[PDB]
Amino acid sequence: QNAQALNTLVKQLSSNFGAISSVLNDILSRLDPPEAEVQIDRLITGRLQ
Amino acid sequence: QCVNFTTRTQLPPAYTNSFTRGVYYPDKVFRSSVLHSTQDLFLPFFSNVTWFHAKRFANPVLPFNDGVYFASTEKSNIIRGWIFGTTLDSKTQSLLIVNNATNVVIKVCEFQFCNDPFLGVYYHKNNKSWMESEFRVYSSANNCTFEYVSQPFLMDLEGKQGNFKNLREFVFKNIDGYFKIYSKHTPINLVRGLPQGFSALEPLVDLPIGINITRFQTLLALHRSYLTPGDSSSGWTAGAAAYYVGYLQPRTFLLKYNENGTITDAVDCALDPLSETKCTLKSFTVEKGIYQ
Amino acid sequence: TSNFRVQPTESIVRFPNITNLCPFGEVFNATRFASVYAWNRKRISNCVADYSVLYNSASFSTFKCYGVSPTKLNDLCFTNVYADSFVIRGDEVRQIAPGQTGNIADYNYKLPDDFTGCVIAWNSNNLDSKVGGNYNYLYRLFRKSNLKPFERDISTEIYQAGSTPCNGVKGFNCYFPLQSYGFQPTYGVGYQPYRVVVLSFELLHAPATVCGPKKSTNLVKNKCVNFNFNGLTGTGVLTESNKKFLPFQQFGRDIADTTDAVRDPQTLEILDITPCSFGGVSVITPGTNTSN
Amino acid sequence: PGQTGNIADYNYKLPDDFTGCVIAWNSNNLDSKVGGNYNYLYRLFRKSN
């Protein structure tokens, strides 16, 4: 159970949560902060949940 | 000579079993030992494929819908090319591919194809060897907005040129205007069916052609010898080969990459309930119990 | 209290070694842009994608991008890039965009929802608008349904208006697929033609050889660096591994979709990405009343 | 704020928040003279933004 909880916690890092990508380094390096902020915030909300 | 015969035979479509076939790398990413799951178009396990026999004029029109699988158990590479498109009568734009010892010409022109297209090779002519001779595949190439040549793509594997047979394995995919091709060739000793193993098909080329494709022809390259009279369709009626046809559709495979990054085994989530259990549980071994 | 993480000591950029310049000069300043009913697919590739002459330049009425910032275009390496160049009307300027339904946005040219890439537009009064009559440019109206994005249609048959069958060159309740244009210098905004080119990328899936003039810094290993491989940023400690990348495999991911393996675009060796030796710091502390 | 362009990146920029706003109107009646309004200019680049 502990290992499964940790594994799904890791695997949740590969989800978009509505963003354009599941990695921050492709959002920051492809969008100016004014409109990258919304995608970063989508990922923030998903990963925080 | 672009002329044909009225008919050869009403092709009896014998079927066979695609045991573990249609598995190809769905992505351009190396992965270590992991159990990944992709929603890509594959060939479902244990599916009946239209086993076409080369000796009896197996070059019909075949609906190319959502991709089509293809194999060839043969030596000396009887069947060479393919003829795609949605109209095939030069009225509308259409694809064309060939394969020979010069280079694999790939074109998208308003071609007027021949009713019996193939590659005739008149051999034993002045050198006691073989030399490609015929090009009766089409007549006109008036309008065109694409072309490509790479090299003569006849991947004759090792084995002193056909100790075993050369099994081409080909996937052609056409979605959102991008023609995708995957390929692999392996040697086996079975003469009629297909062997028991898992083959993974690497990509080779993409085409920015965007042409509506609904058929294909599978140029068989009809030739036996340079002393066979015919009407440019029959006469060269000699094929010691066979080529298989298999459709593709959404199949949420679950791919098992090993430590070497190769797709050792795969699982199809619609073949049977047990495979769907292996999918939902996301593993290959399912312990005793009851799973939703 | 906080977290210990090692900091990057160097910055690294590793792009392919290329010196070509991209056809943007030819593509944008072409003689006669084709008709909107049949646009052009020019596969720009293997060149230094300099977008400085695109954003620092002028006369581009609308240069707005979807998914890619214009100032990051100089730092992104694209697998492929395509230039869709055509001529539209003033009321169709908005229609060349994802969504934003209109007439031509539903009749002859559509963009997908993602559309990683953008468009460039400018007026066409000085080069197209002649009082003689610019009927040489047309567009389709309806093909019994909507079309599909990035697909052409150059079948100049006679399509019926509906509910009645006809043939030949004219029939009642049976129209003509195309509609002409009338660009003249007497036109104005909303009527004057506009020359629109559409760029579409394909980012961060496959190995790429199309990107800007960023100077490839030397390669360092076993040290924390701020590497940049084809635009894939990130901190790591580069080592050497033995991951058998297949020729089409550029990257390598883990379960969390973070690259833990990369291949140099200059010397095709298999690296091993690994983040710095971070951690957390605990602070053992007797009561501040007793000691500090 | 945002809305990148030429002058939005060369001689005048607004912050991302920009609490406050702008007012604009035409200047044909007071500026546009056939003599040539070269009295107004703008910078282009200073090696950076």
Q: What is the 3-state secondary structure (H, E, C) of C224-285?
A: EEEEEECCEEEEEECEECCCCCCCCCCEEECCCCCEEEEECCCCCCEEECCCCCCCCECCCC
Residue of C nearest to B34 (CA): C255
Residues of chain B contacting C148 with CB distance shorter than 8 Å: 176-177
Long-range (24+ apart) CB contacts under 8 A made by D2-5 are: D2/A32, D2/A34, D2/A35, D4/A32, D4/C70, D4/C71
Residue position matching structure tokens 């003279």: D33
Within 10 A of C94 (CB to CB), how many other CB atoms are there?
12
Query: Residue B216's CB: how many other CB atoms inside 10 A?
Result: 22
Contacts of C65 (CB under 8 A, 6+ apart): C73, C117, C118
- Which residue matches tokens 């995608």? A39
Using a CB-CB distance cutoff of 8 angstroms, which residues of chain D are in contact with residue C56?
45
Measured distance CA(C7)–CA(C2) in Å, rounded: 15
What does the alpha-carbon distance between residue C205 and residue C230 come to, in Å, rounded to a whole number? Answer: 11
The CATH code of domain B15-292 reads 2.60.120.960
- Spatial strand order of the sheet with C224-229 comes to C10-11, C224-229, C232-237
Phi, psi of C170, deg, nearest 5: -165, 135
* B263-267: strand order across its sheet: B34-38, B253-257, B263-267
DSSP structural state of residue C35:
P
If we measure between CA atoms, which residue out of B79, B76, B81, B168 comes closest to residue B130?
A: B76
Q: In b/e form, how buried is each residue of C106-119, taking b as 16+ CB within 10 angstroms?
A: ebbbbbeeebbbbb
Report the distance separating Cα B193 and Cα B73, nearest Å.
9
Q: How far is A40 from chain C (nearest CA, A)?
A: 13
Secondary structure E strands in chain B: 14-18, 23-24, 29-30, 34-38, 41-42, 47-53, 68-74, 94-97, 106-109, 144-148, 165-175, 178-188, 200-207, 242-247, 249-250, 253-257, 263-267
Cα A33 to Cα B23: distance, rounded to the nearest angstrom: 41
Backbone angles phi, psi at C26, to 5 degrees: -75, -40
Q: Are strands B144-148 and B106-109 parallel, antiparallel or unpaired?
A: antiparallel
Q: Which residues pair with B113 in a beta bridge?
A: B138
Q: What is the Cα–Cα distance from B155 to B181, expressed in whole angstroms?
A: 15
- What is the C-alpha separation between B126 and C224, in angstroms, rounded? 68
Give the chains touching B; criterion: ≥3 Cβ pairs < 8 Å: C
Work out whether strand B200-207 and strand B23-24 pair parallel, antiparallel, or are unpaired.
Answer: parallel
> Torsion angle, CA of B84/B87/B90/B92, rounded to 10 degrees?
-100
Chain A residues touching residue D1 (CB < 8 angstroms): 34
Check the CA dihedral C12-C18-C19-C22 and report its sign: negative
* C232-237 and C271-272 beta bridge pairing: unpaired
3-state secondary structure of B205: strand
Chains in contact with C, where contact means 3 or more Cβ–Cβ distances below 8 Å, are: A, B, D
Is it the case that chain D and chain B have 3 or more CB pairs lying under 8 Å apart? no
Q: Which of residues 8-47 of D touch A (CB under 8 A)?
A: 16
Residue B85 CA to residue B196 CA, distance in Å, equals 34
Taking an 8 Å cut-off on Cβ atoms, the answer to whether A14 and C76 are in contact is: no
Minimal CA separation from D28 to chain A, in Å: 34
Calpha distance C134→C121 (Å, rounded): 19
Experimental technique behind these coordinates: cryo-EM
Sheet with B29-30, strands from edge to edge, namely: B29-30, C251-253, C259-262
User: Per DSSP, what are the bridge partners of residue C44?
Assistant: C81
Is residue C88 within 8 A of residue C193, CB to CB? The reply is yes
| Closest to B213 measured CA to CA, from B132, B38, B95 | B95
What residues have CB less than 8 Å from B151, skipping those under 6 apart? B103, B104
The tokens of C193 are what? 């033609």
Rg (CA), chain A: 12
Burial label for C62, CB within 10 Å (0-12, 13-18, 19+), is: middle
Residues of D in contact with A32 (CB under 8 A): 2, 4
A38 touches chain D (CB under 8 A): no
Indicate yes or no: CB of B91 within 8 angstroms of CB of C155.
Answer: yes
Q: d(Cα B11, Cα B173) in Å, to the nearest integer?
A: 26
Q: Where are the alpha helices (DSSP H) in B17-161?
A: none
Structure-block tokens of residue C200: 């579409």
What is the domain partition of chain B in residue ranges?
15-292
Resolution value in angstroms: 3.2
Please tell me the distance from the alpha carbon of residue C151 to that of residue C159, in angstroms, as a whole number: 18
Instruction: Take residue C69 and report the two structure tokens written for it.
Output: 């910032």
Q: Which chain C residue shows the shortest CA-CA distance from D10? A: C56
Rounded Cα gap, residues B82 and B64, in angstroms: 11
H or E element, residue A46? helix A33-48
CA–CA separation, C40 and C252 (whole Å)? 35
> C161-183 in b/e burial notation, b at 16+ Cβ within 10 A?
eeeeeeeeeeeeebbbbeeebeb
Phi, psi for residue C56 in degrees, rounded to 5: -80, -15
Evaluate whether B278 touches B109 at the Cβ level (below 8 Å): no
Task: Output the CA–CA distances (angstroms, integers) from residue B215 to B245, B260, B281, D6, in the order listed.
Answer: 12, 37, 39, 51
Token code pair at residue B154: 């006849």
Buried/exposed code over B2-33 (b: 16+ C-beta within 10 A; e: otherwise):
bebeeeeeeeeeeeeebebbbbbbbbebbbee
The Cα B66–Cα B212 span in angstroms is 11
C71 interfacial to chain D (CB closer than 8 Å): yes
| Interchain pair C70, D4: CB under 8 A | yes
CB of B244 closer than 8 Å to CB of B16: yes
Choose among B140, B146, B147, B145: nearest CA to B90: B140
* C71 with D4: Cβ contact below 8 A: yes
User: Do residues B96 and B113 lie in contact, with contact meaning Cβ atoms separated by under 8 Å?
Assistant: yes
DSSP state of C222: S
Instruction: Determine the Cα–Cα distance for residues D11 and D21; give it in Å rounded to an integer.
Output: 18
Phi, psi of C183 (to 5 degrees): -55, 120
